[PDB]
């Protein structure tokens, strides 16, 4: 269904049991190493990137015409960036930083997000992985030790290509509450085109014709006689 | 048919029930948050980009030779850019801006424009979607809060690849009224090449020949005798 | 046949009934809006770009070996650029400029040039269209209103990929009159290689041999006797 | 299995009997030529690059559904850079440096790492080689001789594309010890989604129904009679 | 065969009856318009570019193993650039320059070079054309009129992809006369590897063996008796 | 086999009878024209570029599993650059330099290196040619004549893509003599992983079992009786 519920489930699966995310924001942390259980751990942040490549193809075999409202299959790329900052005070050389454990944590998150098909949204039809990039670039302006040497920053991206089912009926003015008012005015004094409304069958009228002897024709009015006009629920009489 | 009627229908489907477009113009808004029902909403704008990739292929199976005038299938890319400006006065951190709702609004517009095949123009043969790009770039020069920090700008593009039927007969000098005068002069004193005009059959003349005994030949003038000259409507006699 | 006659026909089809071309030249116009019938119209220009991608493939099924002179199929890309200048004095905002009508005029020219197969040259075998680009770039240095704001320029290109038949016999020193003298001298004192000349049959001589009894051999001179030497027109006797 | 054990085995295979690695670090060496057995050898270093292109495809024929926990196939690119510094004091001209021996050492390492399928990890399914690049760039700022001429640096990369099997069960909080605390708190006060736990069968209860004479139906409760309730281990009685 | 004879034939076909080449050199001409027959013509030059993409594939079906010396098929790209300078004194506007005639001259040269398969070299197996580029760039620093406006330069390239047969026997020290001395010394005191020399059969010796009764064996020396030793020309006796 | 022996053979084939290489080094020559037999020839140099694209695929049909040691097929690109310097004192114009002879010399080297399959190394399985590039760039800083005009430099590259067989047994510590000491110490106090050693069969012991009447089972110890223990060479008794 809707991408905000899906993205909330995606970040929940991300931080579920794999990555510990101390803060969420676009900024390398300048906090000291975090002390928990008398053990020091590096600062980290997560940047949730805006959803891109939002495309609706209507051209997949996994779209069922249920006959109520037209369904769609939507493709999206959901991009998350996790950054860990390793201070140079404790990590003197590049090779002693725990890059291996970061890669292990990254592959574990990839496996957990891929396996959780039924746990992210029921309407997910495909989840695929783009090749992840791991960078050991320096921090933005974060210095640790004497001489003002830049701290080690380990940056890992996760880009999930995900295909899921949607319908028109899933979107309501409640999810647009802080961006768009319901029932606004048209920008050029035009009328809004109202979509179709689900039609309810609250009466049926049948008018049958008794055709002439050779065969039914149904075009000329003298070749058939009106027999009766039938209202399938008797209560439709005198109502419409 | 013609692209201005089609583009008017396309923008109408866009603002129909999905995106609320406060203004139309190439400029990030410096208006305050718009107050409606005592609720504040971010400023927005739409840029309707000029139609590009206008190509006529005449090489598709959905072009019927009706025998009146030659039809064409035209492909075009119609590009719309919607920009929302979120002031930093209310939205202090990047992650608290409602990117999810913007993506939901974008996917809803994509679904609505794709479904409305019969509502945009009857002569649409294909509508497809390029991957949409969502950017969280800063505003052009719009500052909100103290220190003159740039406001958040959420930019979303929609590029519709659309294939539709056209004919020569659909274009008249009325739709060119403010760009081109009808019946202008040639730039090098040349003559204008007049296209074919629909021919009306207002008389038919048949001259049949009685051929010689072995077989019809129809080349030599002594091997056939003129019998009669027939004018299919009798009123063509003494007229032409 | 030859590209100058073809290009003259191509520009003639262009300005025939679609685009009104006020001037032909590589320069955005600084003339005022042109008044015709008391109606003001924007200035325009056309740039006819030099023919590029001139390739001769001799590898198509539409090349007939007529046995006189070797034919060729030539491919070329013919590029025309039409620029309209819309003054900011009348057109205050970008969205009120008549981009839709420009796109309509462009698609009409594309359809008219594509349909006119028999009208441009009889030897055209294919005409195809590259995707057209429509730009709303500013004018070169043309300012309209106060503050010296650059005028709106609408630039539309048309690139026709066109395949046509040619032969060696179609090119004569008349079409090179102002670029090359006929019968020039070789740059390194070399001799010019004269192409083959159409051979005319003005006499035929047959010398037949009466072969020996077992079979014709035709190699050894004692196994056949000369019977007669036949000159097919009697007037070839005593002539050659 | 896990990439840190695999990478430790990969560097071990690298330095096993092929490359002699004096130091491990991102820096061209400024140490003098190393004297061993009264023979001088050039300084060298190895840079172990961070693992990139970590992708989990779950779409290979070499993934067995064992029915315990879902397996995965992971692809990774492991990149090692070996740099040798040849002083200009001994190596006066470029062509007398032993580039051939470096290329021989490089091809030997490539062959040894490729052959050792069973020696790096048992769960390796594929090891492939990207084209190696050998550079004779100068040193960073290392000068040897008079005039401060830059020393010769021979840089050779080895990029192994490697596909291997993984499972969720292979990752424990022990391998994340210095990067992540076990059993942390959720960043938005959310609950952690616990993965499935291996279910142990410590009792089985069977309730069979005696169906009516025509056939089993199993939907309506009057068409079958409860016969007995069977506990497969007798000790499950009075326990659950 | 050899490329210098082929390239001499290629430039000869170029200037044969199509392009008039006043000078050959890499430089836009500053000579005045050339007066011949009291008619003024624009200056021109030709740049013969160095042969590139020289590749020997030995992997084509048009290479016959004649059994004397191994043949090859060589591919080359031969690039010629013709530049015409049109003074602004006579050619005031861009559109009045005779670009059409230049394109006609270019297509005529392309057709003539393509047709002349038997006239350039007998061993040509393929001649193909890359797409030609025609530029209306300004001259290098050539000014014509007042204000020092740059003259019009029309630049047209011709790149012939050509495949031809070669053999080792075609290259002799005569064609290298001014670049390489015959019979030079090896740069590292090595010996030169002499190619095979055509072997002439000036004698034949046959030694036949009379085999034992069950069958020929030809391995053990007691199972066959030497009968005679035959010298096919009797004069080989007492000679070798 | 090993690339240094192969590269020595490759440069030997290069200078064998085709290119005369006066010096080997990365530098355009400033020596005068070389006088031999009273004839002046241009200076030249050769740059042997470091071997790149060293890839071991183990995925070709030309790799035989001999069952001793695992073989490999190695691909490499061997790049040689030959530069000739033509002084402007003798060569006044560009077109009079002997580019044709240089191209002839280049194609002859390409043919000779391609043909010499059995002469470069016996284990070559493929030799292919990349498209060669011929440049007429100026010299680095070499001036000839008055005004200090840069001398003509003709640069031709030869890039051989070559596929050849290798094995682990071909590499010994003798070929690494000046780069790596034999039997070095591990960088992290690890043990070296010794490769398999060729196993020699110096004794065979067979213990056969007499099975029970219904059939051989070979799992339970009571269903078979030990008959004898056979040592195939009698001298293995009392030895092991």
Numbering used by the authors:
A (entry chain b), B (entry chain a), C (entry chain f), D (entry chain c), E (entry chain e), F (entry chain d): 1 to 240
Q: What did the paper state?
A:
A-1(L) is a Myoviridae cyanophage isolated in 1970s9 that specifically infects the model cyanobacterium Anabaena sp. PCC 7120. Using cryo-electron microscopy (cryo-EM), we solved the structure of A-1(L) tail machine, which consists of three parts: a 205-Å-long neck, a 1045-Å-long contractile tail with a complicated baseplate, and six pairs of tail fibers. The dodecameric gp2 portal, the pentadecameric gp5 and the hexameric gp7 sequentially constitute the neck of A-1(L), to which five neck fibers are attached. The long and contractile tail of A-1(L) contains 24 rings of gp10 hexamers that form the tube, surrounded by the sheath of 24 helically stacked gp9 hexamers.
Moreover, docking of tail to the neck is accomplished via direct interactions: Loopβ4-β5 (residues Gly55-Thr65) of one gp7 subunit and antiparallel β4′-β5′ hairpin of neighboring subunit interact with Loopα1-β1 (residues Ile15-Val34) and Loopβ5-β6 (residues Leu135-Trp152) of one terminator/gp8 subunit, respectively. In detail, the ring formed by Loopα4-α5 (residues Ile83-Tyr99) of 15 gp5 subunits is hooked by six long α1 helices (residues Met1-Leu25) at the N-terminus of gp7, whereas Loopα1-α2 (residues Leu20-Glu30) of three gp5 subunits tightly interact with the Loopβ5-β6 (residues Thr70-Lys75) of trimeric gp82N. In contrast to the initiation with two separate proteins, the termination of the tube and sheath is fulfilled by a same terminator. Each terminator subunit simultaneously interacts with two tube subunits via Loopβ3-β4 (residues Thr58-Gln71) and β5 (residues Thr125-Leu135), and one sheath subunit via a protruding β7-β8 hairpin (residues Asn202-Ile240), which disrupts the inter-ring interfaces of the tube and sheath, and eventually terminates the extension of tail. Notably, the A-1(L) terminator is structurally different from the previously reported ones in the tailed phages and eCISs. The tube and sheath start from the tube initiator/hexameric gp18 and sheath initiator/hexameric gp30, respectively, but both stop at the same terminator/hexameric gp8. In addition, structural analysis suggested that all pairwise interfaces are complementary in shape and electrostatic potential, enabling the interlocked assembly of the symmetry-mismatched A-1(L) neck.
